[PDB]
PDB file of C-alpha atoms and ligand atoms in Angstrom:
ATOM      1  CA  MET A   5       0.034   0.020  -0.191  1.00  0.00           C
ATOM      2  CA  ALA A   6       1.232   3.717  -1.024  1.00  0.00           C
ATOM      3  CA  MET A   7      -0.997   4.516   1.616  1.00  0.00           C
ATOM      4  CA  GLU A   8       1.128   2.948   4.253  1.00  0.00           C
ATOM      5  CA  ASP A   9       4.476   3.764   2.541  1.00  0.00           C
ATOM      6  CA  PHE A  10       3.013   8.172   2.566  1.00  0.00           C
ATOM      7  CA  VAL A  11       1.856   7.948   6.382  1.00  0.00           C
ATOM      8  CA  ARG A  12       5.657   5.913   7.737  1.00  0.00           C
ATOM      9  CA  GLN A  13       7.350   9.295   4.877  1.00  0.00           C
ATOM     10  CA  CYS A  14       4.795  12.011   6.047  1.00  0.00           C
ATOM     11  CA  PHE A  15       5.152  12.098   9.634  1.00  0.00           C
ATOM     12  CA  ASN A  16       7.827  11.604  12.543  1.00  0.00           C
ATOM     13  CA  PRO A  17       7.672   8.642  13.437  1.00  0.00           C
ATOM     14  CA  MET A  18       6.686   9.105  17.470  1.00  0.00           C
ATOM     15  CA  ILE A  19       3.388  10.116  15.888  1.00  0.00           C
ATOM     16  CA  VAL A  20       3.534   7.034  13.555  1.00  0.00           C
ATOM     17  CA  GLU A  21       4.516   5.002  16.628  1.00  0.00           C
ATOM     18  CA  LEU A  22       2.084   6.728  18.853  1.00  0.00           C
ATOM     19  CA  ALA A  23      -1.032   5.807  16.052  1.00  0.00           C
ATOM     20  CA  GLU A  24       0.421   2.056  15.379  1.00  0.00           C
ATOM     21  CA  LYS A  25       0.264   1.795  19.091  1.00  0.00           C
ATOM     22  CA  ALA A  26      -3.785   3.201  19.393  1.00  0.00           C
ATOM     23  CA  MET A  27      -4.803   1.096  16.320  1.00  0.00           C
ATOM     24  CA  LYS A  28      -3.261  -2.782  17.246  1.00  0.00           C
ATOM     25  CA  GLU A  29      -3.489  -2.752  21.334  1.00  0.00           C
ATOM     26  CA  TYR A  30      -7.275  -2.299  19.526  1.00  0.00           C
ATOM     27  CA  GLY A  31      -6.661  -5.219  17.235  1.00  0.00           C
ATOM     28  CA  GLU A  32      -6.834  -3.009  14.205  1.00  0.00           C
ATOM     29  CA  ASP A  33      -3.825  -3.484  10.930  1.00  0.00           C
ATOM     30  CA  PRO A  34      -2.706  -0.090  10.560  1.00  0.00           C
ATOM     31  CA  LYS A  35      -1.498  -2.374   6.696  1.00  0.00           C
ATOM     32  CA  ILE A  36      -4.961  -2.795   6.422  1.00  0.00           C
ATOM     33  CA  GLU A  37      -7.138   0.242   8.038  1.00  0.00           C
ATOM     34  CA  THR A  38      -4.658   2.477   5.996  1.00  0.00           C
ATOM     35  CA  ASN A  39      -7.246   5.176   5.714  1.00  0.00           C
ATOM     36  CA  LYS A  40      -7.679   5.004   9.034  1.00  0.00           C
ATOM     37  CA  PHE A  41      -4.256   4.698  10.179  1.00  0.00           C
ATOM     38  CA  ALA A  42      -3.219   8.378   7.896  1.00  0.00           C
ATOM     39  CA  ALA A  43      -6.521   9.853   9.769  1.00  0.00           C
ATOM     40  CA  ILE A  44      -4.948   9.073  13.398  1.00  0.00           C
ATOM     41  CA  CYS A  45      -1.436  10.578  12.502  1.00  0.00           C
ATOM     42  CA  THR A  46      -3.017  13.806  10.870  1.00  0.00           C
ATOM     43  CA  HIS A  47      -5.003  14.348  13.638  1.00  0.00           C
ATOM     44  CA  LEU A  48      -2.361  13.914  16.216  1.00  0.00           C
ATOM     45  CA  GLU A  49      -0.049  15.824  14.238  1.00  0.00           C
ATOM     46  CA  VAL A  50      -2.692  18.544  14.359  1.00  0.00           C
ATOM     47  CA  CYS A  51      -3.039  18.642  18.523  1.00  0.00           C
ATOM     48  CA  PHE A  52       0.892  18.516  18.690  1.00  0.00           C
ATOM     49  CA  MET A  53       1.043  21.620  16.638  1.00  0.00           C
ATOM     50  CA  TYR A  54      -1.638  23.106  18.296  1.00  0.00           C
ATOM     51  CA  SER A  55      -0.331  22.157  21.452  1.00  0.00           C
ATOM     52  CA  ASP A  56       3.314  23.570  20.566  1.00  0.00           C
ATOM     53  CA  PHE A  57       2.061  27.040  19.512  1.00  0.00           C
ATOM     54  CA  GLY A  58       1.667  28.052  23.597  1.00  0.00           C
ATOM     55  CA  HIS A  68       3.049  26.041  28.686  1.00  0.00           C
ATOM     56  CA  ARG A  69      -0.215  27.273  27.479  1.00  0.00           C
ATOM     57  CA  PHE A  70      -1.385  23.625  26.600  1.00  0.00           C
ATOM     58  CA  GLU A  71      -1.782  20.601  28.075  1.00  0.00           C
ATOM     59  CA  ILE A  72      -1.464  17.476  25.842  1.00  0.00           C
ATOM     60  CA  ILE A  73      -4.220  14.932  26.823  1.00  0.00           C
ATOM     61  CA  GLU A  74      -4.523  13.512  23.488  1.00  0.00           C
ATOM     62  CA  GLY A  75      -1.669  10.912  22.338  1.00  0.00           C
ATOM     63  CA  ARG A  76      -0.913   9.361  26.087  1.00  0.00           C
ATOM     64  CA  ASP A  77      -1.970   6.111  27.140  1.00  0.00           C
ATOM     65  CA  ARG A  78      -5.345   5.951  28.882  1.00  0.00           C
ATOM     66  CA  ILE A  79      -4.307   5.887  32.777  1.00  0.00           C
ATOM     67  CA  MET A  80      -1.796   9.163  32.051  1.00  0.00           C
ATOM     68  CA  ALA A  81      -4.672  11.089  30.089  1.00  0.00           C
ATOM     69  CA  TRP A  82      -7.441  10.555  32.774  1.00  0.00           C
ATOM     70  CA  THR A  83      -4.679  11.127  35.318  1.00  0.00           C
ATOM     71  CA  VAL A  84      -4.324  14.455  33.644  1.00  0.00           C
ATOM     72  CA  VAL A  85      -7.737  15.299  33.240  1.00  0.00           C
ATOM     73  CA  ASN A  86      -8.067  14.550  36.754  1.00  0.00           C
ATOM     74  CA  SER A  87      -4.957  16.630  37.895  1.00  0.00           C
ATOM     75  CA  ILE A  88      -6.686  19.487  36.178  1.00  0.00           C
ATOM     76  CA  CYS A  89     -10.243  19.368  37.630  1.00  0.00           C
ATOM     77  CA  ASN A  90      -8.525  19.076  41.460  1.00  0.00           C
ATOM     78  CA  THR A  91      -6.184  22.075  40.789  1.00  0.00           C
ATOM     79  CA  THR A  92      -8.732  24.574  38.535  1.00  0.00           C
ATOM     80  CA  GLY A  93     -12.229  23.282  39.842  1.00  0.00           C
ATOM     81  CA  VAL A  94     -13.111  22.551  35.957  1.00  0.00           C
ATOM     82  CA  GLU A  95     -16.086  19.642  35.664  1.00  0.00           C
ATOM     83  CA  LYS A  96     -14.590  15.971  34.915  1.00  0.00           C
ATOM     84  CA  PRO A  97     -15.413  15.414  30.988  1.00  0.00           C
ATOM     85  CA  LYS A  98     -17.196  12.599  30.277  1.00  0.00           C
ATOM     86  CA  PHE A  99     -14.863  11.926  26.690  1.00  0.00           C
ATOM     87  CA  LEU A 100     -10.818  12.641  26.920  1.00  0.00           C
ATOM     88  CA  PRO A 101     -10.640  15.341  24.818  1.00  0.00           C
ATOM     89  CA  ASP A 102      -7.363  16.559  22.860  1.00  0.00           C
ATOM     90  CA  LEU A 103      -5.528  19.971  25.026  1.00  0.00           C
ATOM     91  CA  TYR A 104      -6.630  22.583  28.230  1.00  0.00           C
ATOM     92  CA  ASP A 105      -6.183  25.429  28.020  1.00  0.00           C
ATOM     93  CA  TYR A 106      -4.780  26.833  31.246  1.00  0.00           C
ATOM     94  CA  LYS A 107      -5.125  30.663  29.415  1.00  0.00           C
ATOM     95  CA  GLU A 108      -8.829  29.900  28.589  1.00  0.00           C
ATOM     96  CA  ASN A 109      -9.375  27.536  31.565  1.00  0.00           C
ATOM     97  CA  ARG A 110     -11.440  25.014  29.509  1.00  0.00           C
ATOM     98  CA  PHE A 111     -10.646  21.338  27.562  1.00  0.00           C
ATOM     99  CA  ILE A 112     -10.341  21.893  23.867  1.00  0.00           C
ATOM    100  CA  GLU A 113     -12.038  19.368  21.762  1.00  0.00           C
ATOM    101  CA  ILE A 114     -10.315  19.028  18.005  1.00  0.00           C
ATOM    102  CA  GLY A 115     -11.039  18.027  14.999  1.00  0.00           C
ATOM    103  CA  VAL A 116     -10.233  17.293  11.366  1.00  0.00           C
ATOM    104  CA  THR A 117     -12.303  16.894   8.931  1.00  0.00           C
ATOM    105  CA  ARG A 118     -12.692  15.961   4.816  1.00  0.00           C
ATOM    106  CA  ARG A 119     -16.064  17.254   5.232  1.00  0.00           C
ATOM    107  CA  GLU A 120     -17.538  20.555   5.631  1.00  0.00           C
ATOM    108  CA  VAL A 121     -16.911  21.968   9.139  1.00  0.00           C
ATOM    109  CA  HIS A 122     -20.167  23.065   9.975  1.00  0.00           C
ATOM    110  CA  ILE A 123     -20.971  18.984   9.706  1.00  0.00           C
ATOM    111  CA  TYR A 124     -18.387  17.795  11.517  1.00  0.00           C
ATOM    112  CA  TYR A 125     -18.664  20.546  14.238  1.00  0.00           C
ATOM    113  CA  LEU A 126     -22.520  19.583  14.886  1.00  0.00           C
ATOM    114  CA  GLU A 127     -21.040  15.984  15.085  1.00  0.00           C
ATOM    115  CA  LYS A 128     -18.533  16.755  17.599  1.00  0.00           C
ATOM    116  CA  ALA A 129     -20.808  19.033  19.793  1.00  0.00           C
ATOM    117  CA  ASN A 130     -23.912  16.187  19.617  1.00  0.00           C
ATOM    118  CA  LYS A 131     -21.480  13.818  20.952  1.00  0.00           C
ATOM    119  CA  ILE A 132     -20.121  15.842  24.203  1.00  0.00           C
ATOM    120  CA  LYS A 133     -23.829  17.851  24.742  1.00  0.00           C
ATOM    121  CA  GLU A 135     -20.386  19.408  28.126  1.00  0.00           C
ATOM    122  CA  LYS A 136     -18.358  22.597  28.525  1.00  0.00           C
ATOM    123  CA  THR A 137     -15.675  22.146  26.323  1.00  0.00           C
ATOM    124  CA  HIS A 138     -14.363  24.183  23.853  1.00  0.00           C
ATOM    125  CA  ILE A 139     -14.169  22.713  20.168  1.00  0.00           C
ATOM    126  CA  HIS A 140     -12.020  23.569  16.633  1.00  0.00           C
ATOM    127  CA  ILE A 141     -12.435  21.871  13.572  1.00  0.00           C
ATOM    128  CA  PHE A 142     -10.104  22.578  10.849  1.00  0.00           C
ATOM    129  CA  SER A 143     -10.762  20.871   6.972  1.00  0.00           C
ATOM    130  CA  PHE A 144      -8.019  20.171   4.535  1.00  0.00           C
ATOM    131  CA  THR A 145      -9.396  23.060   2.902  1.00  0.00           C
ATOM    132  CA  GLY A 146      -8.151  25.671   5.417  1.00  0.00           C
ATOM    133  CA  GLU A 147     -11.575  25.970   6.902  1.00  0.00           C
ATOM    134  CA  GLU A 148     -12.045  25.951  10.415  1.00  0.00           C
ATOM    135  CA  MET A 149     -14.981  26.241  12.686  1.00  0.00           C
ATOM    136  CA  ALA A 150     -14.699  26.407  16.726  1.00  0.00           C
ATOM    137  CA  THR A 151     -17.564  27.361  19.137  1.00  0.00           C
ATOM    138  CA  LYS A 152     -18.101  31.235  19.245  1.00  0.00           C
ATOM    139  CA  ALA A 153     -16.113  31.457  16.687  1.00  0.00           C
ATOM    140  CA  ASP A 154     -13.473  31.396  19.197  1.00  0.00           C
ATOM    141  CA  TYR A 155     -10.535  30.356  17.840  1.00  0.00           C
ATOM    142  CA  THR A 156      -7.906  30.501  20.380  1.00  0.00           C
ATOM    143  CA  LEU A 157      -4.470  31.007  18.984  1.00  0.00           C
ATOM    144  CA  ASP A 158      -3.095  33.362  16.907  1.00  0.00           C
ATOM    145  CA  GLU A 159      -3.865  33.714  12.977  1.00  0.00           C
ATOM    146  CA  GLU A 160      -0.088  32.504  12.370  1.00  0.00           C
ATOM    147  CA  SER A 161      -0.463  29.008  14.411  1.00  0.00           C
ATOM    148  CA  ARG A 162      -3.788  28.816  12.780  1.00  0.00           C
ATOM    149  CA  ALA A 163      -2.519  29.130   9.316  1.00  0.00           C
ATOM    150  CA  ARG A 164       0.838  26.330   9.743  1.00  0.00           C
ATOM    151  CA  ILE A 165      -2.328  24.568  10.775  1.00  0.00           C
ATOM    152  CA  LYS A 166      -4.229  24.794   8.152  1.00  0.00           C
ATOM    153  CA  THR A 167      -1.172  24.885   5.620  1.00  0.00           C
ATOM    154  CA  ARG A 168       0.208  21.261   6.756  1.00  0.00           C
ATOM    155  CA  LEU A 169      -3.043  19.819   6.717  1.00  0.00           C
ATOM    156  CA  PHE A 170      -3.724  21.161   2.517  1.00  0.00           C
ATOM    157  CA  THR A 171       0.165  20.066   2.097  1.00  0.00           C
ATOM    158  CA  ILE A 172      -1.196  16.584   3.627  1.00  0.00           C
ATOM    159  CA  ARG A 173      -4.161  16.131   1.437  1.00  0.00           C
ATOM    160  CA  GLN A 174      -2.229  17.509  -1.445  1.00  0.00           C
ATOM    161  CA  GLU A 175       0.579  14.629  -1.310  1.00  0.00           C
ATOM    162  CA  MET A 176      -2.547  11.822  -0.905  1.00  0.00           C
ATOM    163  CA  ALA A 177      -3.523  13.476  -4.114  1.00  0.00           C
ATOM    164  CA  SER A 178       0.041  13.401  -5.295  1.00  0.00           C
ATOM    165  CA  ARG A 179       0.094   9.677  -4.962  1.00  0.00           C
ATOM    166  CA  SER A 180      -3.578   9.212  -5.970  1.00  0.00           C
ATOM    167  CA  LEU A 181      -4.719   8.437  -2.380  1.00  0.00           C
ATOM    168  CA  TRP A 182      -6.825  11.441  -1.286  1.00  0.00           C
ATOM    169  CA  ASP A 183      -9.916   9.781  -3.083  1.00  0.00           C
ATOM    170  CA  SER A 184     -10.091   7.000  -0.787  1.00  0.00           C
ATOM    171  CA  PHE A 185      -8.920   9.375   1.969  1.00  0.00           C
ATOM    172  CA  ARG A 186     -11.824  11.930   1.672  1.00  0.00           C
ATOM    173  CA  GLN A 187     -14.659   9.040   1.063  1.00  0.00           C
ATOM    174  CA  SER A 188     -13.743   7.143   4.221  1.00  0.00           C
ATOM    175  CA  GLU A 189     -15.006   9.773   7.355  1.00  0.00           C
ATOM    176  CA  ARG A 190     -18.550   8.953   8.098  1.00  0.00           C
TER     177      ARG A 190
HETATM  178  C1  HRJ B 201      -8.558  10.502  14.136  1.00  0.00           C
HETATM  179  C2  HRJ B 201      -9.941   9.929  14.409  1.00  0.00           C
HETATM  180  C3  HRJ B 201     -10.107   8.836  13.393  1.00  0.00           C
HETATM  181  C4  HRJ B 201     -11.199   7.972  13.057  1.00  0.00           C
HETATM  182  C5  HRJ B 201     -11.148   6.980  12.269  1.00  0.00           C
HETATM  183  N1  HRJ B 201     -11.987   5.973  12.119  1.00  0.00           N
HETATM  184  O1  HRJ B 201     -11.790   5.156  10.340  1.00  0.00           O
HETATM  185  C6  HRJ B 201     -11.047   6.873  10.100  1.00  0.00           C
HETATM  186  O2  HRJ B 201     -11.050   6.440   8.889  1.00  0.00           O
HETATM  187  N2  HRJ B 201     -10.793   7.595  10.963  1.00  0.00           N
HETATM  188  C7  HRJ B 201     -11.765   7.726  14.682  1.00  0.00           C
HETATM  189  C8  HRJ B 201     -11.730   8.793  15.745  1.00  0.00           C
HETATM  190  C9  HRJ B 201     -10.582   9.634  15.483  1.00  0.00           C
HETATM  191  C10 HRJ B 201     -10.439  10.681  16.826  1.00  0.00           C
HETATM  192  C11 HRJ B 201     -10.798  11.617  16.202  1.00  0.00           C
HETATM  193  C12 HRJ B 201     -10.344  12.782  17.364  1.00  0.00           C
HETATM  194  O3  HRJ B 201     -10.814  13.944  16.775  1.00  0.00           O
HETATM  195  C13 HRJ B 201     -10.052  12.207  18.122  1.00  0.00           C
HETATM  196  O4  HRJ B 201     -10.454  13.001  19.416  1.00  0.00           O
HETATM  197  C14 HRJ B 201     -10.120  10.589  18.994  1.00  0.00           C
HETATM  198  C15 HRJ B 201     -10.136  10.552  20.081  1.00  0.00           C
HETATM  199  O5  HRJ B 201      -9.980   9.284  20.174  1.00  0.00           O
HETATM  200  O6  HRJ B 201      -9.557  11.176  21.116  1.00  0.00           O
HETATM  201  N3  HRJ B 201     -10.504   9.854  17.775  1.00  0.00           N
HETATM  202 MN1   MN B 202      -8.782  13.270  21.288  1.00  0.00          MN
HETATM  203 MN1   MN B 203     -10.241  15.162  18.432  1.00  0.00          MN
END
């Protein structure tokens, strides 16, 4: 699979390994579910990028479940903020709120409703597309123009890379 080769070549090994771990532990093979693998990596990278543009953010996504919940509990105990039912992706120490990060091959409003419906919580939601569109709750985009622009550019580059290798048509039809 070119798709597996693309993944190993466009994401850095820590991300690839983190994505592989999370698939394999749940009995999913990244050489078979190659679109899912590419999606997990993409989303991981966005979460890491989002975190890196701030010690403003706590990274929750990408840790094992014990650690993610340890981090969430520890944030809750010290800030007082409500404990989410689902593991979010980051915590924002400036805005004092969790963030759910969405990356979608579909329209941002569509994916946004899917997320908000799933955590109907007082978690902030920020959706990115592979087209440069974003949507965030209350149109509050958390980051500055430049950090958002780097995320959008990276996502658009992944898409175009996939398109170079004729993987994009498959990739975008494999989301809900
Ligand atoms: C990135 C991803 C991909 C899939 C997926 N399954 O088949 C695919 O093509 N993608 C399912 C869930 C998730 C996912 C998305 C999120 O935004 C997210 O916060 C999580 C999470 O588990 O915390 N998982
Ligand atoms: Mn997550
Ligand atoms: Mn997410």
